[PDB]
């Protein structure tokens, strides 16, 4: 083919259209309460009736679900109670609830394409990364239900894109665009941490990327001039204000909204001290008013303590070492009359290729450093910097979203690897531009064939496991056997 | 005072004498089976009657206990069964069993002094490190029982000393002394890993110290000449042979001894496949012979699998974050008639000072690097290199023996921090030579007063908690209250 801005735009539009198609196709088929739709639907409904409740997660995801429900006009009283009850016979708009994660997943694919486009890679690399995210069964299966992991993944991708936009403005510090993208990176990180607490890992990524930059900004002998200590102080203050203080303010604002919406007694009042019982205006009596900081501190301590002790066992808990190569998958919902399972797992071909390319990138960096120690360059200036500045950045994200799961010893599931795997899909694309590289990009035919073959193979693998992702077509017993690759408990054999 | 080789020798002799005094004083007082003397005494006895058994730990520690028992001549049939039965009314030499860990603890204090002496520090620094190890209640309490953690700590200290000896010979590579100390470092690491599997962490330390060295040996532009690739290949081959292959050979040799000693049926035969039942010569019948590698592989796989699933709950399991500052301690043995407890905990003053000095060293390194980035040296060549080569090495050991406990999520106890705390006692001494430094060592009076004050305070703290370490003097209820500093469950209040 060829390469031009028009081709970039055409590819981006097609990728976004196919993302919206795949995430929304058959979104209402399970039409029943599924693996963890129970809790989050309960909390979204409690938001709608303004009755107070208690949860261990930060509120923003359930606020988004409640906003989607409120937009339709549903208030109702169908607070979910058990896995396996029909939504349609209860006059509840579950499709409206499920449309938000689908929109966020489609926007996640678009943001992946935007990250690869903004970093400066060629069209085949952006297409490959966006297609690996597009044709992934785990991302599709997570953006299908009432689950707040899609919001987490979208916020992490948005933070990566915002920081890439901001870093390219390093030549015009303290300008309007500079401050705008700094604040936007902070806001994306704030949303990421206000969805789930594991979003803190994104703060590590953008943290590390900042620190290195600050180190580069602290060198007294650097090619781009030198900064006096007050100027570096201004830079550090700007980073701290835009990346630490604004995220905390947005987090606090989301709890302020949570407290303002909930002004009625409900299930979860007893977790608070009697003054908080007094301030809920127990209805369906006198009510007091407390300062916001006191209520926030009490709720935060209680939430941390309950997350420290209130753990419910699940048979499909996984360990971090099983994630990058898909050694085991989780099952969400199944009924025996139609022989339909919704067993949640990634795309085995895509995940294996992405992890293998992670290993190849590690080996390439090691070989380049070893050759440099001998005094051999072997890399152009442009191809070195990118491989350490852009691709390395992506490899940073993966690491910062994968390794911290070994330190945590509570229950973890495969979907916890969805953010990190996202970054894995980026380096892959970069490494296809790298090894098959002859603005110099004449005869991208090599990378074009590489990405075409890899994406066709991943597409075949996604087509193979598509029923298990959707659960619409009832599959025969021998067809269930064909999906038993690495010991997947499909329980229909 | 003054400084000279005679003063070094006098201090070393006094430190060793006091170590042997403190570790052996009242060694037979508990005169009863205690917290984990059960299992290890059982296995040492089974070694003595040559009856086969199964354990999850590598055999070397129980081989040492069985050798100590065999030296006296005891064979008997007193395989331990429950916590809290009298040794003396059963004609068993428990004092002989307990003398080995006491000897190893005294030698550990001596080896700490030797490490500080060989590295080049002044007398007050060596005295401070050796005294912090000497006046530590946790090290004393671990080298008191039939427990194989003292062997682990002694082997780690010996590996550190052996590698310091070897590295000083870097100017005469491939000589007899060079190879001798390389093999000795490998053998010390082999003993460390053949006692308990956590000894692998020492392989990290000496691993890292080697890697940096190899990096320095790989630089094509380095002050001390340049090595062609074959010469660096010879260096890497020597490191791999002395640090990887010899340790594995010694580990295999210890299993060979274990298999040769055990040629009778016993408790633990059923964990093996029927061929291994056939090779045990079931007595108290035909017996076959298997190749050693097959038996070793079967036993190793079974041991790993049982350690992966066979966990027994304990009420005093701790987490790594509680260790450096002694937030909680474990109780081993107690009887209510004499009001005697043997609650195991470190020396709070010594541990707090050691951890605080770890933090101070981190801050000092950070400040030095930050000042260097501005282009300010602020450190002499001699004082820089030491702080990064010797003291840093010690800080490496601590890290490599502490952080890997967060990755592991099984049950961990406070004694697991005994190796790492050892390295913490080294940096402390170094930092007392560092900050109070005016061969230039005129007027060490500052460091002399510093170490005198710190060691007097630690000695008072050790005297305060000495009954809880020994359990000989029955303490009153109000005296139990005085030891309730950071919430220690003494259960005699
Ligand atoms: C086990 C260890 C292993 C295997 C791997 C370790 C991980 C590794 C390798 C690295 C860790 C991560 C690293 C190093 C950095 C992450 C954070 C950083 C530094 C940045 C954040 C990412 C981020 C937005 C990077 C921005 C990159 C954008 C696309 C650059 C825009 O083009 P741009 O003009 O600057 O290119 C060049 O600009 C030069 C100007 O000077 C010029 O000279 C050249 O001609 C050329 O124009
Ligand atoms: C969060 C991060 C923080 C806070 C800390 C990070 C950890 C840090 C700071 C460091 C990590 C560990 C490091 C850097 C190294 C560990 C392993 C290494 C390199 C060695 C193993 C330890 C080890 C046996 C070191 C041996 C040191 C012996 C005592 C040196 C003997 O005296 P010697 O003549 O060589 O001194 C000088 O020899 C020069 C010759 O050139 C000469 O010029 C000088 O005049 C002067 O005679
Ligand atoms: C001086 C700075 C330097 C050197 C350089 C500049 C660095 C820079 C400019 C930016 C990044 C700075 C860095 C490295 C960190 C900053 C983030 C931080 C510590 C705070 C800011 C984040 C916030 C706005 C709110 C944090 C919420 C609070 C209050 C607590 C959370 C507790 C968490 C998150 C517990 C994680 C486990 C979780 C329980 C598992 C369950 O999991 P789940 O809920 O999913 O089931
Ligand atoms: C190429 C090399 C480079 C780059 C540079 C040169 C590096 C160099 C020269 C030296 C060091 C090399 C390094 C970094 C590692 C080498 C060690 C290694 C992996 C093997 C050698 C060690 C052996 C002789 C035997 C190992 C026993 C075996 C077979 C398995 C054990 C399993 C372990 C240990 C499981 C740890 C958890 C434990 C279960 C907790 C329970 O705990 P507990 O039992 O206490 O209750």
UniProtKB/TrEMBL annotation, chains A, B:
GO terms of molecular function: dolichyl-phosphate-mannose-protein mannosyltransferase activity
Family: Belongs to the glycosyltransferase 39 family.
InterPro entries tied to this protein: ArnT-like_N (IPR003342), MIR_dom_sf (IPR036300), MIR_motif (IPR016093), PMT-like (IPR027005), PMT_4TMC (IPR032421)
Protein name in UniProt: Dolichyl-phosphate-mannose--protein mannosyltransferase
Known catalytic reactions: a di-trans,poly-cis-dolichyl beta-D-mannosyl phosphate + L-threonyl-[protein] = 3-O-(alpha-D-mannosyl)-L-threonyl-[protein] + a di-trans,poly-cis-dolichyl phosphate + H(+); a di-trans,poly-cis-dolichyl beta-D-mannosyl phosphate + L-seryl-[protein] = 3-O-(alpha-D-mannosyl)-L-seryl-[protein] + a di-trans,poly-cis-dolichyl phosphate + H(+)
Location of this chain's protein in the cell: Endoplasmic reticulum membrane
SMART domains in alphabetical order: MIR
A cellular-component GO term for this protein: endoplasmic reticulum membrane
Keyword terms, alphabetized: Endoplasmic reticulum, Glycoprotein, Glycosyltransferase, Membrane, Repeat, Transferase, Transmembrane, Transmembrane helix
Chief localisation class: endoplasmic reticulum
Bilayer topology: Multi-pass membrane protein
Purpose: Transfers mannose from Dol-P-mannose to Ser or Thr residues on proteins.
CDD domains associated with the record: beta-trefoil_MIR_PMT4-like
Origin superkingdom: Eukaryota
Regions crossing the membrane: 8-27, 56-74, 95-115, 145-166, 197-215, 236-255, 349-367, 387-405, 439-465
Listed pathway(s): Protein modification; protein glycosylation
Enzyme class: transferase
Enzyme Commission designation: 2.4.1.109
